[PDB]
Structure 1
Amino acid sequence: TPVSEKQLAEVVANTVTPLMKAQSVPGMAVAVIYQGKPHYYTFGKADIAANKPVTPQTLFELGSISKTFTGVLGGDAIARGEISLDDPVTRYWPQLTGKQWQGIRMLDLATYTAGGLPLQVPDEVTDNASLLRFYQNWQPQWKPGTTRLYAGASIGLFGALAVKPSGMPYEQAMTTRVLKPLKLDHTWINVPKAEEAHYAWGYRDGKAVRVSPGMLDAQAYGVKTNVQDMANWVMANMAPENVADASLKQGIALAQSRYWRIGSMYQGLGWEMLNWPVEANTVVEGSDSKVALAPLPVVEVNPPAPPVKASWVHKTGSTGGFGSYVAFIPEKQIGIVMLANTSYPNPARVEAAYHILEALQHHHHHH
């Protein structure tokens, strides 16, 4: 039942064309990973005003898909013996002397279980001193390890602390330990002026926009990349047996380990996982912001379960002007990347991606 390029191209087009119309998406780049190989599909415009078409080289903002890079870099640090998820946060930031921090572990930051850290670091925070004030002033609503509340302020901090023992700035640690080893040479925390010709504009309510700088931006939402590098990132995570760098391979395994169970999802490091087989509605309902952003009770997996091959591993991510999603099933060696220059509802992303991967697993051969 080996699905031809043409039949794959038609499946993708048949889902993506109507999606971009219904959601008013100017531009989309799609990769489908199938039998060891990425396949690329591009639609519409990277830049409306200048009439520039999306290509497999166009850069998109990943928004929260950046957190998968943070989890893997953090896993690489663990594999290097530089940090432990079991360590108190104060071990890496002794300045966090507030009593509410006793009992909060690097594990908790990494997996949103610290007790209610907020969705974003406050816009008022502009430097180290104001960042410290923020964490020092923060009053948790729950005790550590009891409630998951998805938060860029939690994993963002985990990412900044993870790299401290390295003595490298985060961008340098990420480039040296993750991006260069995987040959992700068009993946940027800061897009160079030389690369700006490839950088899509984002769109929100008719306005051209790009993500604004912020504290812990690189760790929580600041990665930009094209559909080729993103496909290669998904492949490294889908088939870590192909990752020649040993500590990075082990980091990838740690980022897909199961730390907590929250209903039908398990929380990895940045990555989230549902067991396969999973029905569309279960994945789609999960991505609705009424569930995705809610504080929910966790069940600890003790010790953390190592990666399960029969998983739907995925991550959504947005910025003001961008909406993206990636998913893969390591058992089946298939996966999808959908990068867009408008932030449209997460359940619409998941439904499309799921439809395409389902159509790839249940293709017909009758003509």
Structure 2
Amino acid sequence: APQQINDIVHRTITPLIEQQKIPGMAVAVIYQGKPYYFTWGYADIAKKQPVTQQTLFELGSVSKTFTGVLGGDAIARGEIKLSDPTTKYWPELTAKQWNGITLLHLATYTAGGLPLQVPDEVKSSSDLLRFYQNWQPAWAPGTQRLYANSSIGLFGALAVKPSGLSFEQAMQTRVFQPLKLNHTWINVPPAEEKNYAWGYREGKAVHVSPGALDAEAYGVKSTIEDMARWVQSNLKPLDINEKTLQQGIQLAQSRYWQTGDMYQGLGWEMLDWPVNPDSIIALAARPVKAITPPTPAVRASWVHKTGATGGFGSYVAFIPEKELGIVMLANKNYPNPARVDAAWQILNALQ
């Protein structure tokens, strides 16, 4: 890699890894549209396996960006509409609080207070229905944002219903395969297990546990090369052959709501570029202003998403206008501000 990229990356990441005590990390910088890879440490401390360009890391919430683009693709196909009532795709959702809650609200955490987590006891299809039927909103739809897996997770599950495919089948065939993400999985195949890094939480090796709507809200596992390719696709959607996929990417980067300096897309979150790095809590309810109608993907934006699981910590950020981006995958869930600080240090130096 160009010495400049080599230098800002190592000078920024090496101190981060030791300050946060990260067992292993992989980073990709997309510069002028080309990827440059870097890796450090261990994928498996006990087995002394290093982190490589083929190592799989749990993406946690960065998985929501795939869910948003898949939903976007379904909209482009004419299979669903964001303006459609949730009950249209789930008829047995007869409880009256749902009148008025659209797929848009579900996709953007604006349904009225759906919880961050789907309860651990919800572990069956009927359990899931019971849960949503009994949920009591705190607010009217389209008034406040409360980040939630029970919200975008449900959007993902309903978005693929017309297709008839399971969420994993639709993700593989409509998003992973067309984009050549051949080492990105919702469920890691035994063939790829030797590359699946262990997560580390308080010194213990851990992998994400199964849970309702896990696939849809935080279940993707991927490599630094496939994530670099995911960023390239999002940086230049118009370069994608598949028409509905190309449009689905643009729809996921459209600005539906605003809270402070941040704009909510489908999965992705955006801020106007240049951004104040300062501008880039277990539960934060924030009033949102509707963007009517939604602003189409803005090239001068810092588009990003943080993600975590018990044992992993991820971050992706890119700036379309500069053909610039970064992916940071670690097998330790460490503070988000540390992620964003290192990302900005690197991208600001290269812009």
- TM-score normalised by the shorter chain: which range applies? over 0.9
User: How do residues 239-254 of structure 1 correspond to structure 2 at under 5 angstroms?
Assistant: 239-254=236-251
Q: How far did 1:282 drift?
A: 1.1
Q: How far did 1:242 drift?
A: 1.4
What's 1:307 paired with? Answer: 297
What's 2:314 paired with? Answer: 324
Q: How far did 1:16 drift?
A: 0.7
The C-alpha deviation readout for 1:36-91, integer Å capped at 9, x for no partner, is 20000001000000111000100000000000000000000000000000000000
What's 1:337 paired with? Answer: 327
1:229 to 204, 218, 226: 226
Matched, 1:54 2:44: no
Rounded Cα–Cα distance in structure 1 between residues aligned with 2:53 and 2:103: 37
1:157 to 138, 154, 157: 154
Q: TM-score, normalised by structure 2?
A: 0.99
What's 2:19 paired with? Answer: 22
Question: Which letter does structure 1 place at the counterpart of 2:335?
Answer: P
Question: Which letter does structure 1 place at the counterpart of 2:325?
Answer: G
What's 1:133 paired with? Answer: 130
RMSD: 0.8
Rounded Cα–Cα distance in structure 1 between residues aligned with 2:104 and 2:293: 12
SS at match of 1:300: strand
Rounded Cα–Cα distance in structure 2 between residues aligned with 1:151 and 1:37: 34
Question: Which letter does structure 2 place at the counterpart of 1:23?
Answer: Q
User: How many percent of aligned residue pairs carry the same amino acid?
Assistant: 70
Q: How far did 1:258 drift?
A: 0.5
Rounded Cα–Cα distance in structure 1 between residues aligned with 2:216 and 2:184: 14
SS at match of 2:278: helix
Gap runs ≥5 in structure 1? 284-288, 362-367
Gap runs ≥5 in structure 2? none
Rounded Cα–Cα distance in structure 1 between residues aligned with 2:182 and 2:239: 18
Matched, 1:86 2:83: yes
What's 1:277 paired with? Answer: 274
The C-alpha deviation readout for 1:307-345, integer Å capped at 9, x for no partner, is 100000000000000000000000000000000000001
User: How do residues 1-367 of structure 1 correspond to structure 2 at under 5 angstroms?
Assistant: 5-283=2-280, 289=281, 293-361=283-351
Rounded Cα–Cα distance in structure 1 between residues aligned with 2:35 and 2:237: 16
Rounded Cα–Cα distance in structure 2 between residues aligned with 1:64 and 1:167: 25
Q: TM-score, normalised by structure 1?
A: 0.95
Q: How far did 1:280 drift?
A: 1.1
Rounded Cα–Cα distance in structure 2 between residues aligned with 1:130 and 1:310: 43
SS at match of 1:280: coil
Rounded Cα–Cα distance in structure 2 between residues aligned with 1:313 and 1:158: 21
Q: How far did 1:7 drift?
A: 2.1
SS at match of 1:282: coil
The C-alpha deviation readout for 1:93-114, integer Å capped at 9, x for no partner, is 0111111111101100000000
Higher mean C-alpha deviation, range 5-14 or range 199-208: 5-14
Question: Which letter does structure 2 place at the counterpart of 1:19?
Answer: L
How many residue pairs end up in the alignment? 351
Question: Which letter does structure 2 place at the counterpart of 1:9?
Answer: N
Question: Which letter does structure 2 place at the counterpart of 1:310?
Answer: A
Rounded Cα–Cα distance in structure 1 between residues aligned with 2:213 and 2:45: 30
SS at match of 1:167: coil
SS at match of 2:38: strand
Rounded Cα–Cα distance in structure 2 between residues aligned with 1:134 and 1:14: 48
Question: Which letter does structure 1 place at the counterpart of 2:299?
Answer: K
Rounded Cα–Cα distance in structure 2 between residues aligned with 1:319 and 1:57: 20
Question: Which letter does structure 1 place at the counterpart of 2:73?
Answer: D
Rounded Cα–Cα distance in structure 2 between residues aligned with 1:91 and 1:83: 10
Question: Which letter does structure 2 place at the counterpart of 1:204?
Answer: R
Question: Which letter does structure 2 place at the counterpart of 1:243?
Answer: I
Question: Which letter does structure 1 place at the counterpart of 2:345?
Answer: H
Question: Which letter does structure 2 place at the counterpart of 1:45?
Answer: Y
SS at match of 1:129: helix
Rounded Cα–Cα distance in structure 1 between residues aligned with 2:186 and 2:324: 27
Question: Which letter does structure 1 place at the counterpart of 2:167?
Answer: Y
